[model samples]
Target: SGSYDVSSQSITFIPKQLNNPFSDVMLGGGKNAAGEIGFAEVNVVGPLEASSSSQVSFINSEVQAGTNVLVIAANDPDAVCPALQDARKAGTKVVTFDSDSAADCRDLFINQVESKQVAITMLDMVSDQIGGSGKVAILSATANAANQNAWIKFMEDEIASNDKYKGIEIVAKVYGDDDDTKSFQEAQGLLQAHPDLNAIVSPTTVGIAATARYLSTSDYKGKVFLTGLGLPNEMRSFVKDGTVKEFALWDPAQLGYVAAYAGAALDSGAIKGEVGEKFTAGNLGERTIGENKTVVVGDPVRFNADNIDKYDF
Candidate 1:
């Protein structure tokens, strides 16, 4: 923790991976958020792919390296809880965003959207693209990803309970572990496992992009549906080719920017996690601590050929 001098007030945002465009945008957002308030020394750290133990070790080292505030997207909820609690005990203000650990593991959690809303949007988009019937499947980032689990849970429930989607049937669900090749292979496996597969819902950026790349050049191009939370720039080609009709996501920067300011507020004691307690998050204006010490970034934005070019990050 002491190899180099790290500021006492520094906030470090460790993304799910270092090589992801979404994470890169988020890193910028965090830095900009800290700059808005003149809080210097905010940094972004981490490697690609899921490895809870690896992240936990790096976080512990940061705690010793003088990080007083941390914003992380947990690869696994429980594996990182002990390190997080220990860091908290040592006076590090922890905020989990994008993904989460256990609720009490951190001071605050920044959710991208209401849990059910994400799933509902996911379901409605696929249903709209595929005529509300036929075969469906999920290509997810990680098996224990808290964020995707909640979204998929609601999706599963909505499919089972609602008669509007009675014709939709899930053929298979695969885990990509946030790797490109694995996601591509899994996409192929999904097709092989279910030749009649109608649609694929991938909630992770890596998974969705790799899956789309496969659909774009494969025999299934234009015949199968690919939709979920995806970056607009990455999905433009697929949408343009009719390989993907629509997908949902919010600005990655806002999510990171909100988390950075929220962590700083918690550290500086500007506001506790009280229902009415509020804090300013740069250009996004005032943010309140919602139920369970959480704050929502904003609603998801749907992207397709028509609107994809209008946005960037």
Candidate 2:
């Protein structure tokens, strides 16, 4: 069996990305079912685009060498589904985190937060910063990102249903393709198209950072408020300089830890991947998967001047 044998002296597992928020949390002090610390040999496959065939090949090779479990932060969630299915056929327990895999292709999905929660919280942040009334735009990573699309839909619903946000109007939603230059251009276009736009919400880490940099050095500074899901390290400068008021995200470390636990739980028979199935995450506590095999880690944490310096990477 590929399960760790204490007397065998060693074991190894592989992850999709090394420096990403998901990998950072899951590998840094994350533990497994036996209460033992989690450790894995990481293979840095290029960015999100390389995740499909590259990750599948890597996991297939590891399985051939007798490893049984693989935890991945999918680059293109749906694109990696076929690879995950292949791994399972070869006896590997496939677990996806941060991003996700197709429903029937993987054992579980470890989401950082609930789809609706992320959307509603981000809209609230930007709307409040803009005084609750004005045109807003979304700078998203990609059009096919399941998580981002779901959140955007929820935000749209909130705008229509909530009385407090009656003044909020989403003028345009643009895609950055997760490229820095493209994201900056999209941000600039949003500002140009909506002169009355008072805020921009970016749910992608890459898009948010790129948008903030554009606002910081452009005429848009102070005229438009920027907020969304961004990394602390990436958005710190903007937060300090007043280009942004607040942004929200989960602790990458905690996200990784919870994801690892989700994988281990699936393997240990502690939780099935079915909808409404409940599982425990270390420190963060229990979570229940909803209709789409989705589970939100916890409420998003807002980063402001007072505590923006507290986190790194």
Candidate 3:
């Protein structure tokens, strides 16, 4: 029922944190979208650390500034809910991507892929690396990160109930907090604690890269395995050096690109974050809003030496 002017409205991207390579790459797409959509201006702002409440102030400030859309990657689903709700109350459209805020607080969630599919892809990668049977551990992002937990939960359920995964056992799960130093320490600890560990699955870009770094130089190199969601630019050296054989992720840029369009749609009234609603995402073509007011970009792509050279982000 409400509409917005593209030339008069502005969009702000409040990622989980600043200076993160993954977020930086994703934000590039949002920036590209903004230029093509001819928005008045687009802003990128967030905390340095992805704490549970880190994004609240950014949301508050954007609302105060009358920003039309807030594309956020929430550190915790409920932690940012009140702030997002207030933004909505003030006529700012809330669109969460990379991670989601509470459903009631946001207009749309641009999911990289179905959480279950991410789980399945992660399991498939690790299982294949270890020959379908091994002692595996998870090196995850912050303990409370929404998307990480969602994928981890699904991976656990599949391991428990799927007969094909019966031979796999999750030995331990560790949190890296998405910091490079902490993730390196966690990866070192995982290997030390489980001397017989066959594989490590880190469903986070930071964690996986840090783990790969550790495995590349440690005696465990070539003995233990690593698989998870990662970026080609960060994982290319490890792939070439034989520390990681394969990893999986969707196009990080496309995630933000589609999110930008979805936010624009919500602001312009082309759609109201309803299930079965459809909208065009620039060169990505049309996207449909699915359950819980979500738009899935696409499935994860497996990257290895063969195709790693083709991607820069």
Q: Which candidate is the best by lDDT?
A: 3
Model 3 residue runs over 4 Å out of place are: 1-8, 45-61, 75-83, 132-150, 167-198, 204-207, 218-220, 231-234, 309-313
lDDT of 3 at 82: 99
Q: 80-162 in candidate 2: lDDT tens per residue?
A: 67766877787666667666767877776767677678887898797789897988898998999877889898888888999
In the range 1-313, model 3's lDDT, one tens digit per residue, is 2223488889999889898876788999999987788789899999998799988888898888999989999999999999999998899989999888787999889988887999998888887889979899999999999889999999999999998787889999999999999999999999889999999999988999999999998999989999999989999999999999999988888999998888888888788788888998988889888888988999898999999998887
Q: Rank the candidates by lDDT, best first.
A: 3, 1, 2
Candidate 1 — what's its lDDT? 0.83
Which stretches in model 2 have alpha-carbon errors above 4 Å? 1-13, 18-22, 29-51, 75-92, 141-149, 174-177, 218-220
Worst 10 residues of 3 by lDDT: 1-10
Q: Give residue 216's lDDT in candidate 2 (0 to 100).
A: 97
Q: What lDDT score belongs to each candidate, Candidate 1 first?
A: 0.83, 0.72, 0.90
lDDT over C-alpha atoms for residue 229 of model 3: 90
Q: For model 1, name the residue pairs that clash.
A: none
TM-score of each: 0.74, 0.78, 0.78
- Write model 1 residue lDDT over 54-160, tens digit each, in one string: 68877888888878889998988898899899889998889999888998789889987888888888888888988978889999998998788888889888888
Q: Tell me the spans in candidate 1 whose CA falls farther than 4 Å from its real position.
A: 1-9, 16-20, 45-51, 55-68, 75-83, 131-150, 163-198, 204-223, 231-233, 310-313
Worst 10-residue lDDT window, candidate 1: 1-10
